[PDB]
Amino acid sequence: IFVTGRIAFSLKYEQQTQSLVVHVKECHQLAYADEAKKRSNPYVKTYLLPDKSRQGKRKTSIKRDTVNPLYDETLRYEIPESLLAQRTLQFSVWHHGRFGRNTFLGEAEIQMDSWKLDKKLDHCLPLHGK
C-alpha cells in the first residue's frame, strides 16, 4: 500500500497519575487497503519504543469503512518520567481486514526526550511507509 495522510493527537504527562496521556483524535486521507472497493477499516496502535511487547501496546477501536477515522480515544502509559526521556512514541495505523488480516497503513513517531521539555500539547504528523 502506498501510505498517505496524517494523524492528529495530543500528549500530556500527568504527575497526578505519573502517566503519559496520549489522546488519539483522528486520521485524515488514509490509503485504501481495498482499492477495489475503496475501503479501509482503520485502528491506531502505539508503542513506547523499544518496548514492542504486547502489553507495551495500546490501540484504539476500529472504524469501519473510512479513510478519515475520528477516534477521540485516550491511550495511557503509566510510567515515571525519568524513563520517558529514553523512549520514542510510535503510532502505526492498520486496516483490519478479511479473516482478520491486519494491513499496515502508515506510521509516525515522536521522540520523548525533546518532547519532554515544553511538552507541546497538540500534534499533526504525516504518515510514513516502511
From Swiss-Prot:
Places the protein is found: Membrane; Cell membrane; Cytoplasmic vesicle, Secretory vesicle membrane
Boundaries of every C2 domain copy: 3-125
Quaternary organization: Part of a ternary complex containing STX1A and RAB27A. Can bind both dominant negative and dominant active mutants of RAB27A. Binds STXBP1, RAB3A, RAB8A and RAB27B. Interacts with MYO5A.
Function: Modulates exocytosis of dense-core granules and secretion of hormones in the pancreas and the pituitary. Interacts with vesicles containing negatively charged phospholipids in a Ca(2+)-independent manner.
Protein name: Synaptotagmin-like protein 4
Species annotation: Homo sapiens
Region of the whole protein represented: 354 to 483 of 671
